[model samples]
Target: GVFTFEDEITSTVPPAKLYNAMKDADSITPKIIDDVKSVEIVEGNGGPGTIKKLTIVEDGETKFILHKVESIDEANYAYNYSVVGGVALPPTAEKITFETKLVEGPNGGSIGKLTLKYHTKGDAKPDEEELKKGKAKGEGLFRAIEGYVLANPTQY
Candidate 1:
């Protein structure tokens, strides 16, 4: 079964600054999030087909995940990436992908419209509780980064 999930979050940060902040996440992400130990690009320049390795520690166990950047559209502030490997995926899932579009919202803020596509094993359905947990963690990462970008008005 191919399951999917969408989450939307609004931030007062403008798309330009918010996105600039995101592009520079190698410096910001781990500093704000405790569970994330580090994020570094192990291959390619930070563009399409680039791979980013995220070192994470959850519940005292450190692990890594790889994200292959699909596309990055600075014009509309959109980014597409997929988790290709690392960390045991839920038994039923083969892989997971993500798409993010940050567009102008009311009052010059931005609305983060992100989606998660779950590629599951044959005829398998993911447990809703586990699914929800994944969604929360993913969205909260965005939320944390948003806070950091908003606080440092001088930087991208």
Candidate 2:
């Protein structure tokens, strides 16, 4: 069984800037996002099949986790990835997949679509309380980068 949901956000930056900001994210994310201390590529070359080790710090507490890139399409600003290890797969879930698409929108802005898919065990259902907390964390990451690119104006 499975469970899924989606959330969308609009940014003041264009898709080019918004999308490029996340590509090879290890280069810029830590600099812009406070919670992220570093991102290390555990395998591959920043493309599909790459495993990223992320170090995040919050309230003087540090933690690490692994995320795998399932797919990436720069031309279309689409990306697919999953959280698979050293973290919350959820007591009821096998994995959490994120499929995202960034596209051009009104007056140079961009619309970012985030689909969250949870692969679950039998009697499937996600922990709503936990999911809500996770979503806020994810949104901050998106907002952090968007705000960064919006300010830079000339950067990706």
Candidate 3:
């Protein structure tokens, strides 16, 4: 049996600016992920049906994760991606998903609610190792956006 883990966090930022920053993911990822060596487009731009090749260099191991744009709604500031293919992941398989919704936040700034849904593949049970990996990845992503806000101070 497989299981899914979902979590969400909301932060303040302007809707248009937040959407713009996320829309240009190719240019933004390199800056966000310290482990991500590069993000190259296999075909099409960063939109629905587009494919992206993400390279991560961590612990002296080079891992490759292929991602395909599953869906995107610019007006609502939402996007989805799936693992097209990749290197050998743990037997505790999981389908990863991320979505962002914008609303009003403190002081009238835009509020971005980010949700992550991870579902295990097939009849696989997630283990501690998988949970650790997921937690680290999620924390890094959270920090990246928080850092961006601190640095930007204002939306573009």
Candidate with maximal lDDT: 1
Off by over 4 Å in 3: 1-3, 92-94, 153-155
lDDT of 3 at 101: 64
Tens digit per residue, CA lDDT, model 2, 1-156: 767778998877888878888774677778887877898989898889999998988788898877899898889888777877656677677777777789888988888888777777788778886577557756766777777777887765
lDDT (tens digit, per residue) of candidate 1 on 35-109: 887888989998989999999999998899888888889998986777778873776777777777899989889
TM-score of 3: 0.76
Q: Candidate 3 — worst ten consecutive residues by lDDT sum?
A: 88-97
Q: Report the number of clashing residue pairs per model.
A: 0, 0, 1
Sort by lDDT, top down from the best? 1, 2, 3
Sliding window of 10 residues with minimal summed lDDT for model 2: 129-138
- Candidate 1, residue 149: the lDDT equals 84
Candidate 2 wrong stretches, greater than 4 Å: none
* Ten-residue stretch with the least lDDT total in model 1: 129-138
What TM-score does structure 1 among the candidates reach?
0.88
